[PDB]
Enzyme design. Structure first.
Site, PDB file in Angstrom:
ATOM      1  N   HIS A  56      -0.290  -1.294   3.185  1.00 31.14           N
ATOM      2  CA  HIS A  56      -1.808  -1.437   2.800  1.00 31.14           C
ATOM      3  C   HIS A  56      -2.307  -2.533   2.046  1.00 31.14           C
ATOM      4  O   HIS A  56      -3.403  -2.702   2.128  1.00 31.14           O
ATOM      5  CB  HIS A  56      -2.484  -0.004   2.073  1.00 31.14           C
ATOM      6  CG  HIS A  56      -1.817  -0.041   0.625  1.00 31.14           C
ATOM      7  ND1 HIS A  56      -0.557   0.745   0.362  1.00 31.14           N
ATOM      8  CD2 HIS A  56      -2.238  -0.391  -0.646  1.00 31.14           C
ATOM      9  CE1 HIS A  56      -0.398   0.493  -0.939  1.00 31.14           C
ATOM     10  NE2 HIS A  56      -1.412  -0.312  -1.454  1.00 31.14           N
ATOM     11  N   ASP A 102       4.583   3.020   4.378  1.00 28.26           N
ATOM     12  CA  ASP A 102       3.914   2.136   3.720  1.00 28.26           C
ATOM     13  C   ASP A 102       4.684   0.896   3.303  1.00 28.26           C
ATOM     14  O   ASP A 102       5.032   0.601   2.285  1.00 28.26           O
ATOM     15  CB  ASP A 102       3.328   2.671   2.525  1.00 28.26           C
ATOM     16  CG  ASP A 102       2.085   1.621   2.235  1.00 28.26           C
ATOM     17  OD1 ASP A 102       1.618   0.575   2.807  1.00 28.26           O
ATOM     18  OD2 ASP A 102       1.611   2.070   1.000  1.00 28.26           O
ATOM     19  N   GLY A 127       2.520  -2.588  -3.770  1.00 27.68           N
ATOM     20  CA  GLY A 127       3.632  -3.571  -3.227  1.00 27.68           C
ATOM     21  C   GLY A 127       4.600  -4.188  -4.124  1.00 27.68           C
ATOM     22  O   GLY A 127       5.455  -4.738  -3.632  1.00 27.68           O
TER      23      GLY A 127
END
Ligand SMILES: [Ca+2]
Lengths: 222, 56
Positions: free
Chosen positions: A40, A84, A177
């Site tokens: 994302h 993800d 992240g």
């Protein structure tokens, strides 16, 4: 990072900042030319910043390198957030080393394992306060069952929860992240959660041990 | 009217700056978007925002 502590300059050498005119996500250096982050966090014109502590002032230990390629997992689902994970190839290799890569895991980590979560995200649960320096947090990995009871029908086999059910200690906006390191191995990627540091709502992370093959092969054929 | 809806950050942890139309102020403002599950009152630039929602 809500409820954390200042890491200390370059004590988390594999931590990177994804910059697009400002810090928007974190990531981990797993190779001199590769960085792993969340899907994302995908954006055009990403500049990777390594060797960072104070993201607002140039302290001299930095290396700013543009990304040449950004590979989002082919099965990433933006609705469910499953898979993800994303790989970013640096335009040039970094000089390792204040800057160092983190090892991929040989196997998955069990509930109860204590991990180090880091980032430059929001430090307030009910508010907005972004730090200059890198913040750290020790949080344990939680069982699949409690994770699933915290987020009914939202947890896949590729996600794991970590944190405290009481709340007050968690990852938050700006940490996505970033690394979740346990026993010197990269076990997770900061992904999503309901609010930040809320009670009975621990943070959810991408289960890295499930992607090691995909990662190794993708790095090698790109 | 999605232009009248409050800005939605969502569950993801990124800190991405986006624009939303603020009907009370009569202009597009910035807000922090988390990276996933965006609603419609979420634009990449002020021009896009004004073009879609301006005067709503
Ligand atoms: Ca700096």
């Amino acid at each position: 990072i809500v409820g954390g502590y200042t890491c200390g300059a370059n004590t988390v050498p594999y931590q990177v900042s994804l910059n697009s005119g400002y810090h928007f996500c974190g990531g981990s250096l797993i190779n001199s030319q590769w960085v792993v982050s969340a899907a994302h966090c995908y954006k055009s014109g990403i500049q990777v910043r390594l060797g960072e502590d104070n993201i607002n002032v140039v302290e001299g230990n930095e290396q700013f390198i543009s990304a040449s390629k950004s590979i989002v997992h082919p099965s990433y689902n933006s609705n469910t957030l499953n898979n993800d994970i994303m790989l970013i190839k640096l335009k040039s290799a970094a000089s390792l080393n204040r800057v160092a890569s983190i090892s991929l895991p040989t196997s998955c980590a069990s509930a109860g394992t204590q991990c180090l979560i880091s980032g430059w995200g929001n430090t307030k649960s009910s508010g907005t306060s972004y730090p200059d320096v890198l913040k750290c947090l020790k949080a344990p990995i939680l069982s699949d069952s409690s994770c699933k009871s915290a987020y009914p029908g939202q947890i896949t086999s590729n996600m794991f929860c970590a944190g405290y059910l009481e709340g007050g200690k968690d990852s938050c906006q700006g940490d996505s992240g970033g690394p979740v390191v346990c026993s010197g191995k990269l076990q997770g990627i900061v992904s999503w959660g309901s609010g930040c540091a809320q009670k009975n709502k621990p943070g959810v992370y991408t289960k890295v041990c499930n992607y090691v093959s995909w990662i190794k092969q993708t790095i090698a054929s790109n | 009217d999605f232009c009248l809806e409050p800005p939605y950050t969502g569950p993801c942890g990124a800190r991405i700056i986006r624009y939303f139309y603020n009907a009370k102020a009569g202009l597009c403002q910035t807000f922090v978007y988390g990276g996933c599950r965006a609603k419609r009152n979420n634009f990449k630039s002020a021009e896009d925002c004004l073009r879609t929602c301006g005067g709503a």
